[PDB]
């Protein structure tokens, strides 16, 4: 079976805001990737090996709202640009890639999986360049090898004239390293 | 700063399925 | 005759 | 929810259709030049190509289009009318070998279905099964390029 994904919104502006403050979220969680929001921005967070990882330049040092109130980060690595909270009860984790495949697939916030060719330790070329706005909101999303395993987490886009031609990502290795730190 | 709030999910584990009739 | 859609398949398996 | 593949049927046989680029494609040997039903009446084919065994009407309701493959992968996956996924190794522009040959009945009625790459993008439309002694070992398919060109 090929990589296919879908999305579902679980709450709107107002519920989001109340929950941001309250820090108590009672919604049931399902899925490998969570669509996350702060009062300033929305992005993604991927659950890999029981840990809900996301991009530091988005989550900052914040806590994640949960059924038991705010949950403090398990890992925070300003330099690796990573943060990770214990994966939410009900989520499903992906596992790291063990095949060094250089044919990756970026799963965007809109549940679209677009191919990117690995061209370095933290880069890949979009076989079909897309405008920046489309990639907006996908930070912290996974880059999967053909088998469906986490190779990395989308961090930034390499673009010009407003079109993303490449992507910069946090390799799944920095996660291991960050946990070990 | 408030907590990061989950406003949605993306599910990869789903497989082709015939949409049930209601 | 005419071609009639008797069902649909969503590849992502979205229940929604 | 919205489906990419529609399960259609005529007076005799039943087969599949796939929406790609806003068009609902299928096999000419299933539909022919036939019209497609709608709550407002039958709607005609926007495309008909007896030669490539290809025909397409404007995508129906409850449907969502599939994206053409851009990665050029040969590790294809066939989707049947029962939603079964069958790995197929691409042997050629219109041919692919099932990784596990299956009895013809298993692929029966699935013509017009999609042939996906490892990213779920459309690579081609299942044209016909190539079976030896009642066993589908490989399959014939119309690449998306023909469709991209046809439209
Ligand atoms: C995600 O955080 C999000 N909100 O979804 C965001 C995704 C981008 C795709 C279009 C927006 N990433 C993001 O904002 C990063 C983040 C800032 C700058 N940034 C960018 O993606 C910027 N690109 C960029 O800086 N690219 C280079 C120069 C530097 C990093 C390596 C690649 C080259 C952009 C906003 C698109 C100009 C951080 C990098 C911390
Ligand atoms: Zn792998
Ligand atoms: Zn592809």
B17 CB-near residues (< 8 Å, 6+ apart): C9, C10, C13, C14, C15, D83
CA pair distance B7, A10, nearest whole angstrom: 5
Provide the resolution (angstroms). 2.7
Instruction: Report the relative pairing of strands A51-55 and A64-66 from DSSP bridges.
Output: unpaired
Long-range contacts of the stretch A172-175 (C-beta < 8 A, 24+): A172/A48, A172/A96, A172/A97, A174/A77, A174/A80, A174/A82, A175/A48, A175/A51, A175/A53, A175/A82, A175/A84, A175/A96
Which ligand is closest in space to the CA of residue A82?
A: 1
3-class state of residue D141 by DSSP: strand
Q: What does the alpha-carbon distance between residue A113 and residue A102 come to, in Å, rounded to a whole number?
A: 15
Collapsed DSSP state (helix, strand, coil) of residue A121? coil
D91: left (phi over 0), alpha (psi -120 to 50) or beta: alpha
In this structure, the residue with its CA closest to atom 17 of ligand 1 is A156
Q: Which residues of A touch D119 (CB under 8 A)?
A: 2-3, 105, 113-115
Token code pair at residue D107: 């692929």
Which residue spans within chain A are E strands per DSSP? 6-9, 33-37, 42-48, 51-55, 64-66, 69-71, 75-77, 82-86, 103-107, 113-118, 123-131, 142-145, 149-160, 163-171
The coordinates were experimentally obtained by: X-ray
Q: Whose CA is nearest to atom 28 of ligand 1?
A: A158
- List all residues whose CB is within 6 A of at least one atom of ligand 1: A 41, 43, 55, 57-58, 132, 135-139, 156-159, 168
Torsion of CA A55, A58, A60, A64, to 10 degrees: -80
Chains with 3+ CB–CB pairs under 8 A to C are: A, B, D
* Cross-chain CB nearest to D31 (options C3, C7, C16): C3
Distances from the Cα of D48 to the Cα of A25, A159, D25, D34, D54, angstroms: 53, 40, 10, 10, 6
Residue numbers in D near C2 (CB within 8 A): 34-37, 42
- Distance (angstroms) between ligand 2 centre and the Cα of A93 equals 15
Cβ atoms A73, A83 nearer than 8 A: yes
Q: Which residues of B touch C13 (CB under 8 A)?
A: 11, 13-17
Instruction: Give which of D14, D19, D3, D4 is closest to D144, Cα–Cα.
Output: D19
Q: Which two tokens stand for residue A72?
A: 């403090």
Residues D10, C9: C-beta atoms closer than 8 Å: no
Give the integer Cα–Cα distance in Å for A32 and A90: 10
Structure tokens at D105: 């009945």
- Whether D73 is catalytic is no
Name residues whose C-beta falls within 8 Å of residue D20's C-beta, 6 or more positions apart in sequence: D65, D66, D67, D68, D114, D122, D144, D147
What 3-state class would DSSP assign to A132? helix
**Type and span of the H or E element at A14:** helix A13-22
* Secondary structure (3-state) at D124: strand
CATH numbers and ranges of domains, chain A: 1-94 (2.40.10.120), 95-181 (2.40.10.10)
């Amino acid at each position: 079976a090929p990589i296919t994904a879908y999305a579902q919104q679980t709450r709107g502006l107002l519920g989001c805001i109340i929950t941001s403050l309250t820090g108590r979220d009672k919604n049931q969680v399902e899925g490998e990737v969570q669509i996350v929001s702060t009062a300033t921005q929305t992005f993604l967070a991927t659950c890999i090996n029981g840990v809900c990882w996301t991009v530091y330049h988005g989550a900052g040092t914040r806590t994640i709202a949960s059924p038991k109130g705010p949950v403090i980060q398990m890992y925070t690595n300003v330099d690796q640009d990573l943060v990770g909270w214990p994966a939410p009860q009900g989520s499903r984790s992906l596992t790291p890639c063990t095949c060094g495949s250089s044919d990756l697939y970026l799963v965007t916030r809109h549940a679209d999986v677009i191919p990117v060719r690995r061209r370095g330790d933290s880069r890949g070329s979009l076989l079909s360049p897309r405008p920046i706005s489309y990639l907006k909101g996908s930070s912290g999303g996974p880059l999967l090898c053909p088998a469906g395993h986490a190779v990395g987490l989308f961090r930034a886009a390499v673009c010009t004239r407003g079109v993303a031609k490449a992507v910069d990502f946090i390799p799944v290795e920095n996660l291991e390293t960050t946990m070990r730190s | 700063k408030g907590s990061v709030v989950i406003v949605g999910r993306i599910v990869l584990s789903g497989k082709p399925a015939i949409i049930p009739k209601k």
